[PDB]
Amino acid sequence: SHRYVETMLVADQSMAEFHGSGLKHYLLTLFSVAARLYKHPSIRNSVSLVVVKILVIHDEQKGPEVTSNAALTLRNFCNWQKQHNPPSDRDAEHYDTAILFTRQDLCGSQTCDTLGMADVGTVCDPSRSCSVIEDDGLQAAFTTAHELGHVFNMPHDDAKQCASLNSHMMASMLDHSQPWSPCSAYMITSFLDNGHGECLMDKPQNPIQLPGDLPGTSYDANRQCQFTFGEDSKHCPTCSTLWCTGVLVCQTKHFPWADGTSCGEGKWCINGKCVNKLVP
Numbered sequence: 001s002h003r004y005v006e007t008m009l010v011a012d013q014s015m016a017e018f019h020g021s022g023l024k025h026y027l028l029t030l031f032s033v034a035a036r037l038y039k040h041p042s043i044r045n046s047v048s049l050v051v052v053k054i055l056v057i058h059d060e061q062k063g064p065e066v067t068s069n070a071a072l073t074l075r076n077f078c079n080w081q082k083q084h085n086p087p088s089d090r091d092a093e094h095y096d097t098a099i100l101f102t103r104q105d106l107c108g109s110q111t112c113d114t115l116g117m118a119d120v121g122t123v124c125d126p127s128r129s130c131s132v133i134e135d136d137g138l139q140a141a142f143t144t145a146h147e148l149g150h151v152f153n154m155p156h157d158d159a160k161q162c163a164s165l166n167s168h169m170m171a172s173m174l175d176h177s178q179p180w181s182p183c184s185a186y187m188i189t190s191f192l193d194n195g196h197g198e199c200l201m202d203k204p205q206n207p208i209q210l211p212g213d214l215p216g217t218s219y220d221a222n223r224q225c226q227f228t229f230g231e232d233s234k235h236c237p238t239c240s241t242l243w244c245t246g247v248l249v250c251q252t253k254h255f256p257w258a259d260g261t262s263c264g265e266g267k268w269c270i271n272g273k274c275v276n277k278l279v280p
């Protein structure tokens, strides 16, 4: 049976300032990558992520308090989002989950290595079905999908309950041939089969159309570098690691160039490798 995750995306003031008129397309681009991941057969389930609503916070007073404390930021967002959800899933703009995006560096008690936060197994509880994501560039799509995995009751793959079953999406800190681990396939199947994904059964009405082009088609290497290292950053000056400018000084978060990023005439990056656009 087909599951549909009806989603509201929310961008805080920091994102509105940074992205300007490009914001909505950026969020939708991020989300399109996540949706493709949930369509991978390795998840052993049918799950379509769809957007039913986007809110942009131009005035900080109209949003939740966003802070460097990720758990508090999550709690704040989760309370705030409740007023924006119609009670009935018959309403076209009713959503099963809500994601907040911010430029703010999120932190745990430990460090600020944290890039997102969510609660486990909450997807059909309107009061708790929430994720918060630090936008450090297009790699935020992978953070988005990781946190939604938690929302679907998937643990980290290094956990003890994954030992017999199990690199992958739920790794404690990516294999595009098999993005989801056996444990993740198991844990989401169980969650759904135990009846807890019941809000996900209904089709969306007039969903907000996701971009079908690869993310690198919209955003070149220089743009990718800007998203991660600020607007003064550019591509350093292939495909496997995106190096950006910061004596010539260059830096990297160690992620591949986005899929569809041009790496020459007639060629683009697919899975960290420069290849001909016209496949043989």
Ligand SMILES: [Mg+2]
Pocket (backbone or CB within 6 Å): 083, 084, 085
């Ligand atoms: Mg509203």
Ligand SMILES: [Mg+2]
Pocket (backbone or CB within 6 Å): 176, 259, 270, 271, 272
């Ligand atoms: Mg890929």
Ligand code: NA
Pocket (backbone or CB within 6 Å): 105, 106, 107, 112, 113, 114, 115, 134
């Ligand atoms: Na952080």
Ligand code: NA
Pocket (backbone or CB within 6 Å): 105, 112, 113
């Ligand atoms: Na950081």
Ligand code: NI
Pocket (backbone or CB within 6 Å): 016, 020, 021, 058
């Ligand atoms: Ni704006």
Ligand code: NI
Pocket (backbone or CB within 6 Å): 024, 025, 028, 211
């Ligand atoms: Ni667009």
Ligand code: NI
Pocket (backbone or CB within 6 Å): 065
């Ligand atoms: Ni404040």
Ligand code: NI
Pocket (backbone or CB within 6 Å): 166, 167, 168, 181, 182
């Ligand atoms: Ni594996």
Ligand code: NI
Pocket (backbone or CB within 6 Å): 004, 006, 089, 095, 096, 199, 200, 201, 202
């Ligand atoms: Ni629904």
Ligand code: NI
Pocket (backbone or CB within 6 Å): 231
């Ligand atoms: Ni500027």
Ligand code: NI
Pocket (backbone or CB within 6 Å): 231, 232
């Ligand atoms: Ni500048």
Ligand code: NI
Pocket (backbone or CB within 6 Å): 221, 222, 235, 237
């Ligand atoms: Ni270049």
Ligand code: NI
Pocket (backbone or CB within 6 Å): 252, 253, 254
């Ligand atoms: Ni490093």
Ligand SMILES: [Zn+2]
Pocket (backbone or CB within 6 Å): 146, 150, 156
């Ligand atoms: Zn995690």
